[PDB]
Amino acid sequence: VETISFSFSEFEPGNDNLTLQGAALITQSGVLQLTKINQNGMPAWDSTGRTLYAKPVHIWDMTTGTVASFETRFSFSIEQPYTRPLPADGLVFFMGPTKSKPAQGYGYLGIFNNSKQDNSYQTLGVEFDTFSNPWDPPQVPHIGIDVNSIRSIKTQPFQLDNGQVANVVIKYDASSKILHAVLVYPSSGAIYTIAEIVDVKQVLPEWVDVGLSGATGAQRDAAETHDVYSWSFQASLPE
Amino acid sequence: VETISFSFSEFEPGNDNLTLQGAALITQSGVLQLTKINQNGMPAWDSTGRTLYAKPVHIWDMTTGTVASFETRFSFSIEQPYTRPLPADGLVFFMGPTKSKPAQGYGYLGIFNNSKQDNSYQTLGVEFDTFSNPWDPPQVPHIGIDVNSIRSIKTQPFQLDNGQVANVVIKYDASSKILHAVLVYPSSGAIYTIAEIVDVKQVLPEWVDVGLSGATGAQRDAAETHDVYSWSFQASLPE
Numbered sequence: 001v002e003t004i005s006f007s008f009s010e011f012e013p014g015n016d017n018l019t020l021q022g023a024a025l026i027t028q029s030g031v032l033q034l035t036k037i038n039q040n041g042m043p044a045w046d047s048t049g050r051t052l053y054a055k056p057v058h059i060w061d062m063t064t065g066t067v068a069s070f071e072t073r074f075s076f077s078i079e080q081p082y083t084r085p086l087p088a089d090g091l092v093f094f095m096g097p098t099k100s101k102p103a104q105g106y107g108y109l110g111i112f113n114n115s116k117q118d119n120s121y122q123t124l125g126v127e128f129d130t131f132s133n134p135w136d137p138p139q140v141p142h143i144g145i146d147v148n149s150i151r152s153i154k155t156q157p158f159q160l161d162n163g164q165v166a167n168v169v170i171k172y173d174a175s176s177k178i179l180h181a182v183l184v185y186p187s188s189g190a191i192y193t194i195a196e197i198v199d200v201k202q203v204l205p206e207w208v209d210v211g212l213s214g215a216t217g218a219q220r221d222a223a224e225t226h227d228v229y230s231w232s233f234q235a236s237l238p239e
Numbered sequence: 240v241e242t243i244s245f246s247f248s249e250f251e252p253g254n255d256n257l258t259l260q261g262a263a264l265i266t267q268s269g270v271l272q273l274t275k276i277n278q279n280g281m282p283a284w285d286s287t288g289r290t291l292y293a294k295p296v297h298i299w300d301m302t303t304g305t306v307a308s309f310e311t312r313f314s315f316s317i318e319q320p321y322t323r324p325l326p327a328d329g330l331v332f333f334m335g336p337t338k339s340k341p342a343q344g345y346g347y348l349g350i351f352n353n354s355k356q357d358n359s360y361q362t363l364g365v366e367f368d369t370f371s372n373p374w375d376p377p378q379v380p381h382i383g384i385d386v387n388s389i390r391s392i393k394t395q396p397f398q399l400d401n402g403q404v405a406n407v408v409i410k411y412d413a414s415s416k417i418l419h420a421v422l423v424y425p426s427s428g429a430i431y432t433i434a435e436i437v438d439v440k441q442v443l444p445e446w447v448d449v450g451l452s453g454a455t456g457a458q459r460d461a462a463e464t465h466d467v468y469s470w471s472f473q474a475s476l477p478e
C-alpha cells in the first residue's frame with residue numbers, strides 16, 4: 001500500500017514542504033494568508049495565491065487500475081469588511097497535474113482559465129465560493145464540487161460566519177467513489193454537508209499536486225480574507 | 240411534490256405527534272430518554288425504547304418510480320457510569336414498515352430479530368453502536384449504515400465524549416443515491432463522516448415510519464443512557 005500524509009497544526013515561515021505561489025504567504029503568527037492583506041490590515045482586491053504540498057501524490061495506477069482513498073482537513077476564516085462592492089471570490093481545495101502554476105484569478109479561483117467543462121484541466125476541486133458569477137447558483141456563499149470546470153456538478157449554500165473559523169473535512173472513498181465534504185462552524189454550531197459520486201480515474205492523472213488556492217475580486221475593494229490555520233492530508237493507494 | 244417535515248427543539252410530555260414504545264419517555268425537563276433510568280439516577284440494563292413520528296412518510300412511488308430525498312438532524316448524549324461490565328448497546332435512527340412494534344433488544348437495537356441479512360426486514364438504519372457483538376468490527380463506538388441487517392455495510396469508529404452532546408446530520412440524495420451522515424461533538428470539536436450508496440427502492444416499502452430506538456445490555460449493569468434533546472426531519476417526493 002502506497003501511503004502519504006502530512007499535518008500542519010500551524011504554518012512556519014521558511015518551511016520547504018510547501019510551495020507558495022502568487023500572493024500566498026505564511027505570517028510570523030503561523031497563519032497562511034492565501035490572498036494579500038494591505039499595510040492597513042484590509043484585504044487587497046485583484047489577488048490570487050496558492051499553496052501546494054511539495055510532494056506529488058499517487059492517486060491511481062493505470063497498470064492495476066487501483067485508486068487511492070484520501071482525506072483532508074483544514075480550518076479557514078473569511079472576513080468581508082465592506083458592504084459594497086460585493087466581496088469576492090473565494091477559496092478552493094484542489095488536485096490536478098503536477099508542476100502547475102496559478103491559472104486565472106477572480107471567479108476562476110486560480111485553477112481554471114475559462115468556464116468550459118474541459119477534460120484537459122484534469123482537476124478536481126471543492127470550492128467555498130463567495131461571489132455569484134453567471135455560471136453560479138444565485139446563493140452565496142456555497143460549497144461546490146468542481147470536476148474539470150468551475151461550473152460545479154453539485155452545490156450547497158451555507159451562511160458565512162464573518163471572521164469565524166470554519167472546520168472542513170473532505171473524504172473520498174475509492175470503493176464507492178463517493179466524495180463527501182463537511183463544513184462546521186464551531187462558533188454557531190452550524191453543520192453543512194455535501195456528497196457526490198466522482199470517479200477520479202476519469203478526471204485526474206495518476207500523480208497529482210494537492211493544494212489550496214484563493215482569489216479576491218476584479219473590481220476595487222471586491223475583496224475578503226482567505227486565511228488558513230491548519231491543514232492535514234492522507235492518501236492510501238491499495239497495492 | 241409531496242413534502243413532510245417536523246422539528247422538535249425539545250420534547251413536551253403528552254405530545255401526540257410521537258409514538259413512545261417500550262421504555263421510552265419524555266421527561267418534564269423536555270428530554271427524550273430512550274432507555275430507562277432508575278430512581279437512583281443510573282441507567283437500567285435490559286431496556287429497549289423507541290419513538291416513532293406519528294405520521295408515515297411517502298418515501299417512494301412504484302407508479303412513477305420517483306424516490307424522496309430526506310434529511311434528519313438530532314442531538315443525543317450517552318453516559319457510561321461503570322467500568323465493568325462493558326456498556327451496551329447503543330441507539331439507532333431508522334425507517335421501516337409502518338405500524339411496527341419493537342423487535343429484539345440488546346445488540347439488535349430494537350429493530351432486528353437476528354443477525355441475518357433478510358429482505359423482509361425492509362429497514363434502513365444509521366446506528367451509534369457502543370458494544371462489540373460477533374457481527375461487529377472490534378472498534379466501539381462506531382457509526383454504521385444498516386440495510387436489512389444489523390451487520391452494517393459500512394462502519395466508522397468514533398470516540399465517545401462521555402455525557403457530552405453529539406450533533407448528528409443524516410442526508411439522503413435520491414438522485415445520486417448517497418446516504419451521508421455526520422457526527423460532531425461541539426465539546427471537543429471532533430467531526431466524523433460516513434457515506435455509502437443505498438437505493439431505497441430495493442430496501443424500503445413506499446410508505447415508512449421514521450424513528451429512533453435505543454437498547455441497554457443483556458447482563459447486569461451493562462448499560463448507559465440514550466438521551467435525545469431535539470429531532471427534526473424533512474422529506475420531499477418529486478411529484
Ligand SMILES: *[C@@H]1O[C@H](CO)[C@@H](O[C@@H]2O[C@H](CO)[C@@H](O[C@@H]3O[C@H](CO[C@H]4O[C@H](CO)[C@@H](O)[C@H](O)[C@@H]4O)[C@@H](O)[C@H](O[C@H]4O[C@H](CO)[C@@H](O)[C@H](O)[C@@H]4O)[C@@H]3O[C@@H]3OC[C@@H](O)[C@H](O)[C@H]3O)[C@H](O)[C@H]2NC(C)=O)[C@H](O[C@@H]2O[C@@H](C)[C@@H](O)[C@@H](O)[C@@H]2O)[C@H]1NC(C)=O
Nearest residue numbers: 003004005006007008014015016017018053054055232233
Ligand atoms: C518537511 O521537510 C523536512 C525537511 O526537508 C522533511 O524531512 C526530511 O525528509 C527527507 C526525506 O525526503 C530526509 O532525507 C534524507 O536525509 C538523510 C540524511 O538526514 C538524516 O540523517 C542525518 C545523518 O545521516 C541526520 O543528521 C539528519 O538530521 C537526518 O536525520 C539521507 O541519508 C537520505 O538520503 C538517502 O535517501 C535519498 C532519497 O531520499 C537518496 O538520494 C540518498 O542516496 C540516500 O540513500 C535523505 O536525504 C535526502 O535525499 C534527497 C535529497 O534531495 C535531499 O537533499 C536529502 O536531504 C531528511 O533527513 C529530512 N530532514 C530532516 C531535517 O529530518 C520532512 O519529511 C518528513 O520527515 C522525514 C523525517 C521523512 O520521514 C519524510 O518521509 C517525511 O515526509 C517534511 N515533512 C513533510 C510532512 O513533508
Ligand SMILES: *[C@@H]1O[C@H](CO)[C@@H](O[C@@H]2O[C@H](CO)[C@@H](O[C@@H]3O[C@H](CO[C@H]4O[C@H](CO)[C@@H](O)[C@H](O)[C@@H]4O)[C@@H](O)[C@H](O[C@H]4O[C@H](CO)[C@@H](O)[C@H](O)[C@@H]4O)[C@@H]3O[C@@H]3OC[C@@H](O)[C@H](O)[C@H]3O)[C@H](O)[C@H]2NC(C)=O)[C@H](O[C@@H]2O[C@@H](C)[C@@H](O)[C@@H](O)[C@@H]2O)[C@H]1NC(C)=O
Nearest residue numbers: 242243244245246247253254255256257292293294471472
Ligand atoms: C402536532 O400535533 C398537533 C395536534 O394534533 C397537530 O396539529 C393539528 O393538525 C391537524 C391536522 O392533522 C389539524 O386538524 C384539522 O383541524 C381542523 C379544526 O381545527 C382547527 O380549526 C379550528 C376551527 O375550525 C380551531 O379551533 C383549531 O384550533 C384548529 O385551528 C379541522 O377542520 C380539520 O378537518 C378537516 O380535515 C380533516 C382531515 O385532516 C377531515 O377529516 C375533516 O373532514 C375536515 O375536512 C382537521 O381535523 C382533524 O381531522 C382528522 C381528525 O382525525 C382529527 O381529530 C381532526 O382534528 C388540527 O387543527 C391541528 N391541531 C391544532 C391544535 O392546531 C400538528 O400538525 C401540524 O400542524 C397543523 C396546524 C397542520 O399544519 C399539520 O399539517 C401539521 O403537521 C402536529 N405537528 C407535527 C409536526 O406533527
Ligand SMILES: [Ca+2]
Nearest residue numbers: 107129131133
Ligand atoms: Ca463564483
Ligand SMILES: [Ca+2]
Nearest residue numbers: 346368370372
Ligand atoms: Ca453491537
Ligand SMILES: [Mn+2]
Nearest residue numbers: 129136144152
Ligand atoms: Mn461556484
Ligand SMILES: [Mn+2]
Nearest residue numbers: 368375383391
Ligand atoms: Mn454495529
